[PDB]
Amino acid sequence: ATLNQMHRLGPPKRPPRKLGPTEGRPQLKGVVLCTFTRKPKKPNSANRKCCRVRLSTGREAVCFIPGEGHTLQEHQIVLVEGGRTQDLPGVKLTVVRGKYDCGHVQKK
Amino acid sequence: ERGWSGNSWGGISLGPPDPGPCGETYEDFDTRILEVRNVFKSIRVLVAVGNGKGAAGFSIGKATDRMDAFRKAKNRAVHHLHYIERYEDHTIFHDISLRFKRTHIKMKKQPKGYGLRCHRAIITICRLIGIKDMYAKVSGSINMLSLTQGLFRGLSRQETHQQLADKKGLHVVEIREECGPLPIVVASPRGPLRKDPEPEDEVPDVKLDWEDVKTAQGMKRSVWSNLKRAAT
Amino acid sequence: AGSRLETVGSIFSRTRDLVRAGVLKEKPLWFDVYDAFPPLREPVFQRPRVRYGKAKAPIQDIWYHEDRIRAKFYSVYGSGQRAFDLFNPNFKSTCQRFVEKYTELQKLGETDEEKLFVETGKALLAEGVILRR
Amino acid sequence: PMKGRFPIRRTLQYLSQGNVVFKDSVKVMTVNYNTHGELGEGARKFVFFNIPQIQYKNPWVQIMMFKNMTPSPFLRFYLDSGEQVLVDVETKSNKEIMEHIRKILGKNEETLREEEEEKKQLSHPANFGPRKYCLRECICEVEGQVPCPSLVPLPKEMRGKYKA
RNA sequence: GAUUAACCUUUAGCAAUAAACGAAAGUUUAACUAAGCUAUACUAACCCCAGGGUUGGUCAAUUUCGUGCCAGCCACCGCGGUCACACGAUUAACCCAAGUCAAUAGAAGCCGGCGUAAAGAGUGUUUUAGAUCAAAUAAAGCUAAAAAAAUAGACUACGAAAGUGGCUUUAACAUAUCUGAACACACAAUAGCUAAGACCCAAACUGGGAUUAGAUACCCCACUAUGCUUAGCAACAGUUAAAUCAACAAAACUGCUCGCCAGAACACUACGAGCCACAGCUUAAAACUCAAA
Ligand code: FES
Ligand SMILES: [K+]
Ligand SMILES: [Mg+2]
Ligand SMILES: [Mg+2]
Ligand SMILES: [Mg+2]
Ligand SMILES: [Mg+2]
Ligand SMILES: [Mg+2]
Ligand SMILES: [Mg+2]
Ligand SMILES: [Mg+2]
Ligand SMILES: [Mg+2]
Ligand SMILES: [Mg+2]
Ligand SMILES: [Mg+2]
Ligand SMILES: [Mg+2]
Numbered sequence: 001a002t003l004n005q006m007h008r009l010g011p012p013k014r015p016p017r018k019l020g021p022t023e024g025r026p027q028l029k030g031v032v033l034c035t036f037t038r039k040p041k042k043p044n045s046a047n048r049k050c051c052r053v054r055l056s057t058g059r060e061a062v063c064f065i066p067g068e069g070h071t072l073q074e075h076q077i078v079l080v081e082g083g084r085t086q087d088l089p090g091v092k093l094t095v096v097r098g099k100y101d102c103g104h105v106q107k108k
Numbered sequence: 109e110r111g112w113s114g115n116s117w118g119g120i121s122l123g124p125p126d127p128g129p130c131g132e133t134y135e136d137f138d139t140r141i142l143e144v145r146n147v148f149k150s151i152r153v154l155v156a157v158g159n160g161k162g163a164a165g166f167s168i169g170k171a172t173d174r175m176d177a178f179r180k181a182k183n184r185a186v187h188h189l190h191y192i193e194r195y196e197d198h199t200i201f202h203d204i205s206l207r208f209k210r211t212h213i214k215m216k217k218q219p220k221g222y223g224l225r226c227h228r229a230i231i232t233i234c235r236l237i238g239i240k241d242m243y244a245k246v247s248g249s250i251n252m253l254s255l256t257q258g259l260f261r262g263l264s265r266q267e268t269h270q271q272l273a274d275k276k277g278l279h280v281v282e283i284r285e286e287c288g289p290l291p292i293v294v295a296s297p298r299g300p301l302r303k304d305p306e307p308e309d310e311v312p313d314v315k316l317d318w319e320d321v322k323t324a325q326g327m328k329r330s331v332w333s334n335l336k337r338a339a340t
Numbered sequence: 341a342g343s344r345l346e347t348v349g350s351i352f353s354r355t356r357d358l359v360r361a362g363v364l365k366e367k368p369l370w371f372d373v374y375d376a377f378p379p380l381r382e383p384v385f386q387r388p389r390v391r392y393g394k395a396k397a398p399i400q401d402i403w404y405h406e407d408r409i410r411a412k413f414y415s416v417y418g419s420g421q422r423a424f425d426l427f428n429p430n431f432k433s434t435c436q437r438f439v440e441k442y443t444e445l446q447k448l449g450e451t452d453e454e455k456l457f458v459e460t461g462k463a464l465l466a467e468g469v470i471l472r473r
Numbered sequence: 474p475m476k477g478r479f480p481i482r483r484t485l486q487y488l489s490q491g492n493v494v495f496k497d498s499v500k501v502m503t504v505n506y507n508t509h510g511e512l513g514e515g516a517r518k519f520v521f522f523n524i525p526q527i528q529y530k531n532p533w534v535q536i537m538m539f540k541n542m543t544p545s546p547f548l549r550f551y552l553d554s555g556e557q558v559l560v561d562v563e564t565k566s567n568k569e570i571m572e573h574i575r576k577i578l579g580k581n582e583e584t585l586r587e588e589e590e591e592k593k594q595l596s597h598p599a600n601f602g603p604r605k606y607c608l609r610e611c612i613c614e615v616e617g618q619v620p621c622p623s624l625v626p627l628p629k630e631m632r633g634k635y636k637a
Numbered sequence: 638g639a640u641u642a643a644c645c646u647u648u649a650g651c652a653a654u655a656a657a658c659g660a661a662a663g664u665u666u667a668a669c670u671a672a673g674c675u676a677u678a679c680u681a682a683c684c685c686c687a688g689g690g691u692u693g694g695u696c697a698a699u700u701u702c703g704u705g706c707c708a709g710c711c712a713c714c715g716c717g718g719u720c721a722c723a724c725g726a727u728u729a730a731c732c733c734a735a736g737u738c739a740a741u742a743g744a745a746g747c748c749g750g751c752g753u754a755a756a757g758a759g760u761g762u763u764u765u766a767g768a769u770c771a772a773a774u775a776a777a778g779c780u781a782a783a784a785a786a787a788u789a790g791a792c793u794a795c796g797a798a799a800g801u802g803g804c805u806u807u808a809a810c811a812u813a814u815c816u817g818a819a820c821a822c823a824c825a826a827u828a829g830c831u832a833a834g835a836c837c838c839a840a841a842c843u844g845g846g847a848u849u850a851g852a853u854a855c856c857c858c859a860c861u862a863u864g865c866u867u868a869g870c871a872a873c874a875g876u877u878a879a880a881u882c883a884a885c886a887a888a889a890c891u892g893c894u895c896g897c898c899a900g901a902a903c904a905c906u907a908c909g910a911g912c913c914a915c916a917g918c919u920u921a922a923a924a925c926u927c928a929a930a
Contacts, residue, residue, distance in 0.1 A: 002894065003476055003748080004767075012747055012899095026741040027642040044717085045706045056641070068708065068725075079642070081740040086711065089926075094740085099642095108726060115694060130341035136362070163361040165343075189343045191357030209883045249883080261880080264348055310568065311481060311522055315474040318748045325485050331745045387881075392888070395877050476748050478892070483748095508769065517769095541771095624680055633671035637649075 021061060021092040022082045028093075029100075030055045030063070032076045038062075040087035048088055051095065053078060063093040067105035076101035112228050117144040119232055122178055125157055125186045134159075139182050140232045142166070143252045144174070154253060155181040157189075158236025161197075165189040166233075166256050192263045196220075198240040201266050205317070208258030211251055214317065215262065216243040224340040231340050233259055245319070269295035277302040342368075347385040352378075406439045412457060413438050417471050434471075438464060482525060491526030493571060494580045495534055501551040502527070505539040506562075516546035518567040550578060 001009070022028055030053035037047040049065040051072055064085040065072065072078065072095070079096040098104040111119035122139040136159045143154040151174050158164030165188045169181030195201045195217065204215040218241040224231045226244035229252060234242060246255060269280045273295040280295040322328050342364065343354045352374055358364045359371075391397065413435045420434040442460045449456075464471060474480070481487050495502075504524065506516040520538060528536050548560040548570070558578065562570050600607045613620050619627070629635040 001748085001750090001897090004894080005896090006748070014746075017742090020741085022642090022741065024742065025642065026739095029642070040706095043706095043715090046709070046717090047707085048709095066710090081642090083712090083740065086713090086715090096739085110697095113694085113696065114698090115696090128341060132341060132363070132365070159361065159363070161361055163358065163363050187341060187343070188345050189358065189363060190345065190348060191354070191361055206880085208880095211883095251883090254883085265880085311479055311487075313479055314481065316480045316484075316748095318475050321475065321480075321484055322748095329745060333745090389877075389879090389881075390888075392877050393875095474748075480748085509771070621680090626681085637671065 020082055022080075023057065027079050027081050027096065028055045028057065030061075030078050030080050032072050032074055032078060032101075033060065034074060035065075035070075035072055038088055038091070041089055044087050046087070048085065048091075050088070050091060051078075053080060053093075055080070061093050062091050063095050064088060064091050065095045065102075067097055069106060070095075070102065072102055078102050111141070117141045119228065122155060122182060125182045126179065128183070128186065134186055136160075137163075137186065138236060139185070140236060141178070142229055142232065142256060151177045153177040153181050154256065155185060156233050156236055156256065157182060157185040158233070158238070160236065160238045162192045162194055162238055163189050164192060164233065164237040164260075166260065168253075190260055190264045192237045192239075193266055193268050194238060195269075197238065199242055200239065200263065201268055204262040204266060206258050206262040207248070208261060209251070209254045210249040211254040211258055212247040213255070213258050213262060214245045214247075214319075218242055225337075226340075227255070229255060230259060237263070270298075273297045274299065276306070278306065350383045352382065406443070409439050409442050410435055416457075416473060417461075421470075434469060437469065479522075482522065488526055488529040491523070491530045492579075493523075493527050493530060493575045494585065495527075495531045495578055496580055498552040498554065498556075499531070499534055499550050499578055500553055501535045501537070503537050503539060503549045503551075504546075505543055505549070506546040507541055507544075512563045513546045515564075515566040515570060516562045519562070519570045523567055523571055548574070550574075 033052045033054055035049070035051045038050050040046050040048060049070055050062055051065060052060060053063055054060050061080075063078075063080045077100040079099040079102075080093045081096055082092070083094045085091045085094065095102050109120075111117060118141055120141045122141060125134040125137050125139060127133050134157075137157050138160070139155055139157045141153065141155050143152075145152045147170065150170055150172050152168060152170045153174070154166065154168055155178065156164065156166040165185045167181045167185035167188060169177040169179070169184065171177035171180055193201060198220055199222075200215060200217050202217055204213070206213050220241055222241040222243070224234050224240065224242060226234060226242060227246045227250075230244050230246070233256065234240075267275075273280050274297055277297045277299065278301065279293050279297075282292040282294045283289075284292065323333075342351075342358055345354070348354070349357075352371075355364065355368060355371055359367055417434075417438075422434065424433060425431045438460055441463055442456055445456050445459055445463075461471060475483065477483075504516075504520060506520055507513040508517070524536060524538070528534070546562050548562060550558040550560075552558070560570070560573060560577070565573070596606070598608055601609050601611060603610065609615070611621070612618050
């Protein structure tokens with residue numbers, strides 16, 4: 001572009017950043033509505049442990065439960081952080097282990 | 109010792125070139141690997157050689173075995189040597205802006221002690237040549253072969269102070285801020301000296317880079333510029 | 341051995357640089373001779389370009405004044421029936437005799453091209469040179 | 474690279490090279506110049522190279538340009554008193570025009586040096602305050618004085634926790 | 638208290654400074670001063686006292702077992718199917734260290750481009766400003782071979798483009814700088830409708846005839862809409878000097894101006910607006926998704 005065009009258009013206007021599933025917050029508290037398993041997209045095969053949770057914002061979202069073995073039940077309180085599960089499409093929230101009802105993974 | 113990374117061939121030394129069929133020895137030359145690539149199997153290797161005193165070269169070698177490719181590249185490199193002029197045997201004579209294919213290289217002459225703040229491959233090649241103080245910025249496509257070719261081309265096409273003095277028939281006088289207003293004559297014409305002064309261009313019509321002007325005015329804000337780094 | 345980059349510098353500059361750099365132990369046998377008696381131009385590779393736009397080659401066309409006279413002669417009396425002998429360094433064609441006689445008239449009289457032509461023809465016929473129109 | 478011919482004109486260092494600082498009387502400068510003619514060449518250069526510098530050094534002076542309205546280039550300066558100053562600029566280079574206007578309507582170096590000395594008094598070196606305004610934040614930065622407790626703990630006798 | 642991922646003591650004194658008041662000694666102050674709590678941070682330690690993460694590549698650093706596309710793991714690329722340096726345990730090593738580093742949010746963004754990747758193919762005129770580059774067409778007639786015009790034309794002319802090639806005549810082919818309209822005015826080509834009219838021939842559709850074994854979709858006959866005639870709805874100016882130059886296209890570049898473009902798809906889309914109006918055209922998003930395209 002010419003100098004006149006750059007002057008008229010002015011400085012570049014970077015679009016506002018997109019808010020993620022946590023809405024720009026480190027973590028979010030949530031209530032477990034139901035627990036289930038989902039299958040990965042297929043270069044990989046597994047039964048990933050997931051749970052549907054109603055967040056403190058009121059939105060219902062699917063979260064992944066990391067680690068080997070969980071004891072989450074309905075009506076239990078969990079803390080969910082960001083971070084996509086690369087295998088599961090549409091799952092962008094992860095339950096924090098060792099906070100509220102979700103306990104740390106049992107040794108071995 | 110490792111190269112640019114733990115698992116990377118680049119930057120690794122291959123030792124001196126083998127004594128040539130012409131009968132010359134090259135014990136004062138060091139070889140460095142710049143790139144290794146699988147050709148679909150064979151291996152293509154780009155290596156550079158240099159004695160640290162201005163004589164340096166590079167070559168490609170293709171072979172089924174890696175060591176054969178290394179040997180071929182090294183031996184062919186020693187027979188295609190550039191001589192690179194160095195100002196005071198530590199830096200380049202002037203700033204060099206070049207574009208080889210889609211790779212752009214800006215090189216800046218620097219004072220003593222500045223070090224090599226350059227692309228890692230450029231650091232390797234400069235160490236082979238004997239340049240110790242220089243700044244370099246690589247833009248466009250970062251293609252290793254094009255980078256090497258452009259670097260050698262620009263460094264081989266630099267005009268020395270004596271060349272400029274002979275061309276313009278005038279004294280090349282150096283001004284150093286650390287030396288005050290003292291005029292240092294670095295080169296004088298070998299032939300006769302022109303008695304008419306150079307035109308005092310009130311405003312030269314030079315092509316400026318927005319990068320340099322932006323840095324000079326303080327409008328550069330990059331969090332990655334001027335970071336502390338190991339000695340190079 | 342020297343550098344095989346024939347497109348970078350010249351054989352002289354490459355040899356000199358590699359000698360000073362210590363790569364070459366001894367100068368080649370021709371180096372001193374080249375240094376003492378260099379060529380007029382340093383033999384550096386250059387790629388020949390094509391001329392576009394209003395760029396014309398600087399070669400001129402070789403014309404002389406007498407060419408005009410020659411043209412008229414070759415248009416009026418035609419090519420002489422006697423043949424040209426280009427091996428003889430001092431060959432004198434009929435047209436050349438006409439040219440010299442015309443020049444003598446011009447330097448010994450006025451400047452009227454048609455009058456000079458006809459008077460030259462008359463004098464050549466007087467000397468005994470056949471000239472058919 | 475930087476766009477346009479002579480991109481050095483669009484650098485702050487060049488813009489600060491200007492040596493004409495108008496006296497406070499000058500309010501408006503009009504520059505009438507011609508686009509063609511050798512005798513106006515310098516005036517054209519004056520518009521190309523020096524008007525940016527003059528405007529940079531004199532931000533509150535109104536500079537306006539006019540093209541091909543008269544046979545001859547000229548400058549006119551309007552003063553606060555109501556006076557007008559006419560400067561003919563045929564046959565004059567841009568440097569000559571700059572020197573002429575500097576001489577007739579420019580502040581001299583003595584007045585500028587006086588202004589800088591006045592500016593110096595505003596920043597008294599003895600004051601203590603933020604780095605934006607003062608050399609030192611606190612007296613504890615002065616050697617021989619008691620330093621910060623943040624960097625050197627005070628003895629117990631000088632702390633209230635051990636006095637109460 | 639409630640709520641949020643977010644969580645300091647229901648301390649002391651007016652001794653200093655500040656404020657209020659007083660003529661003043663002085664009096665008052667949850668301002669403030671001095672303390673309490675908290676790895677949030679900085680500084681300095683430490684007599685014993687170290688943890689957290691990481692170890693396939695990017696990127697410093699794995700031994701032995703267990704499991705077998707399961708359990709699980711990853712920031713990106715990816716690992717896991719009986720020899721897994723990538724999962725779990727264990728050993729060792731690596732980085733930082735009273736911290737470590739999982740999540741979140743900032744810090745750092747266009748002087749680059751527009752034939753083939755996103756981005757410059759209807760034409761002309763005006764336009765506030767910026768720059769320095771100051772054989773056309775229309776209308777009348779007429780016509781030879783057989784309504785549209787052999788030769789000329791192996792010509793390359795006229796016009797802004799679309800286009801213009803029989804002959805005669807009458808009008809007649811803007812502009813002394815350049816750039817600069819979706820929105821103004823003219824043209825242009827594109828097929829289809831509205832009133833009428835003509836109808837030799839042809840012919841979408843609609844009927845009828847003949848045909849294999851889902852006949853011929855295809856052949857034959859007839860006749861509609863229609864074919865016809867009116868009346869209407871990148872530009873400009875320079876250079877060949879340089880190293881020519883990703884590739885292929887069409888040899889490269891400069892100056893100046895306008896328009897347009899910033900990963901894919903959503904999307905020649907939705908909504909809004911304008912224009913029309915059976916079909917619509919112009920401008921033109923967002924959410925979700927992906928590591929590519
Ligand atoms: S800043 Fe003065 S005592 Fe700390
Ligand atoms: K007090
Ligand atoms: Mg490693
Ligand atoms: Mg807090
Ligand atoms: Mg507190
Ligand atoms: Mg109290
Ligand atoms: Mg406190
Ligand atoms: Mg493991
Ligand atoms: Mg495209
Ligand atoms: Mg225009
Ligand atoms: Mg345009
Ligand atoms: Mg639409
Ligand atoms: Mg809308």
